[PDB]
């Protein structure tokens, strides 16, 4: 199966002018495995999954030193951003960043990522070529020129095609029992008599891993994603996921609807009906 | 493992 690694940064200024808060969390697929939070007397990177605990103290210190340094630099970056947008010191603002690597079935790098948002909207992103930027506005264009002068893209490319894929592969081996396991969903269909000559059919998927799934309702063969309530894939808490999908049918009787579910854990797509 | 930012990496 294909896998990814991402680091998620938030640098948030405090409303007034207290020290901004910097947080970094690291994921392999949907599994959190590190966290650093700058709001502490002596902040350290901490483990969040069992399989990362085996890394020695030099690994932890390298992480911690990167994050402590980012804590300092992102504070200036925040000051830079509110300057570009003529914003005052009162008011909280945020820089969010995600970067990391996608590998495919082969274990080899499919694509690399480095995207930034300011106050919740796309600000600057590393293009797929890993050598050019997409800048949102003239302010992001100021950031682009700084990052071109500093060869950021080049160094991110080196990381992404080097360090990133290497460590991802390492974490994928160390935690293979959970990261390289795909659990199929437990599926069923619920009937909800709304009474109207109308009813809701709901197709359930429980206990799957990983999170990526497809649930669609079919009217005698045809996909109808319009008029289909498709709820968000949600953590069940025990490192599995859940999802459902619903359609309003003219039941009386009217049972020509099937639910179709695709998931990696599954040998072949399932097709299910309501069994009264 | 995260990437280290070199000097002048500010926004």
């Amino acid at each position: 199966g294909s896998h990814s690694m991402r680091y998620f940064y938030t640098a948030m200024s405090r409303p007034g002018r207290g020290e901004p808060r910097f947080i970094a969390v690291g994921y392999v697929d949907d599994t959190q495995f590190v966290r650093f939070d700058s709001d502490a007397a002596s902040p350290r990177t901490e483990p969040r999954a069992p399989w990362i605990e085996q890394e020695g103290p030099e690994y932890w210190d390298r992480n911690t030193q990167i994050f402590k340094t980012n804590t300092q630099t992102y504070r200036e970056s925040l000051r830079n951003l509110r300057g570009y947008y003529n914003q005052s010191e009162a008011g909280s603002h945020i820089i969010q960043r995600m970067y990391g690597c996608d590998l495919g079935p082969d274990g080899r790098l499919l694509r690399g990522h480095d995207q930034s948002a300011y106050d919740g909207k796309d600000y600057i992103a590393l293009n797929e070529d890993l050598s050019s930027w997409t800048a949102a506005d003239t302010a992001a264009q100021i950031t682009q020129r700084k990052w071109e002068a500093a060869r950021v893209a080049e160094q991110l490319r080196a990381y992404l095609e080097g360090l990133c894929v290497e460590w991802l592969r390492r974490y994928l081996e160390n935690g293979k029992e959970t990261l390289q396991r795909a659990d199929p969903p437990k599926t069923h269909v619920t009937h909800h008599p709304v009474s109207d000559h109308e009813a809701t059919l709901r197709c359930w998927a429980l206990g799957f891993y990983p999170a990526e799934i497809t649930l669609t309702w079919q009217r005698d063969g045809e996909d109808q994603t319009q008029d289909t309530e498709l709820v968000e894939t949600r953590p069940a808490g025990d490192r599995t996921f859940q999802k459902w999908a619903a359609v309003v049918v003219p039941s009386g009787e009217e049972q020509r609807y099937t639910c179709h579910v695709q998931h990696e854990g599954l040998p072949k797509p399932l097709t299910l009906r309501w069994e009264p | 493992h995260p990437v280290g930012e070199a000097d002048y990496f500010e926004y």
């Epitope: - | 990437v3 070199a6 000097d7």
Partner: T-cell receptor, first 110, second 112 residues
């Protein structure tokens, strides 16, 4: 982390040679060559970033593998005599600090 | 050659004394890195400043200290000098493209 060899190089004028730099890092940010003359600060020569990359200027040509860099010096002259420093930046560390090898001290016999 | 300006170029002092070394980065660079080159050993990273604040360190001794001033100039203070402190002290400023540019050095000799 950075080891240079040989530490002392004794060449006849005209005798080409290659200076070796081995490095270990989490990930290479850049490999650097500097020249240092007795009593002066290191002077910039080249930076290389990726395996297979090469840079050449006059009698010096620097190349890079994933394990080492070579500074080849073709038909050297007395004036090439100096210490040659190798240094590396790491992608697992912040900022731009260099960690240096111990240098190759070259003397070219005229 | 090179832009980075270091004073004093030479220092002779006694054991137990304190000295200050001064470094101006190249115009346009915002960082100062301090290195020590001891007799028979390679350059060793001491400490980095960026735009007036401490950035990174450095196997710098507790009896050594440094600062970068709002001016960007930097000072390295060496306290309680021992004979083994005799060495060349280099500072470098980093460019946006990542290259370090070095000063001409301060040679310190400490004498009994």
């Amino acid at each position: 982390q950075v080891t240079q060899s040989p530490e002392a190089l004794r060449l006849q004028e005209g005798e080409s040679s290659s200076l070796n730099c081995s490095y270990t890092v989490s990930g290479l940010r850049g490999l650097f060559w500097y020249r240092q003359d007795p009593g002066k600060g290191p002077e910039f020569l080249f930076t290389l970033y990726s395996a297979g990359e090469e840079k050449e200027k006059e009698r010096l040509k620097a190349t890079l593998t994933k394990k080492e860099s070579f500074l080849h010096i073709t038909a050297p002259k007395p004036e090439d005599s100096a210490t040659y420093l190798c240094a590396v930046q790491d992608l697992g560390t912040s900022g731009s600090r260099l960690t240096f090898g111990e240098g190759t001290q070259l003397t070219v016999n005229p | 050659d090179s832009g980075v300006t270091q004073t004093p170029k030479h220092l002779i002092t006694a054991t137990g004394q304190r000295v200050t070394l001064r470094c101006s980065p190249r115009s346009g660079d915002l960082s100062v890195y301090w290195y020590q080159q001891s007799l028979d050993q390679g350059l060793q990273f001491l400490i980095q400043y960026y735009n007036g604040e401490e950035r990174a360190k450095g196997n710098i001794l507790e009896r050594f200290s440094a600062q970068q001033f709002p001016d960007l100039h930097s000072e390295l203070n060496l306290s309680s000098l021992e004979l083994g402190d005799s060495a060349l002290y280099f500072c470098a400023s980093s460019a946006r493209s990542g290259e370090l540019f070095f000063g001409e050095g301060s040679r310190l000799t400490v004498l009994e």
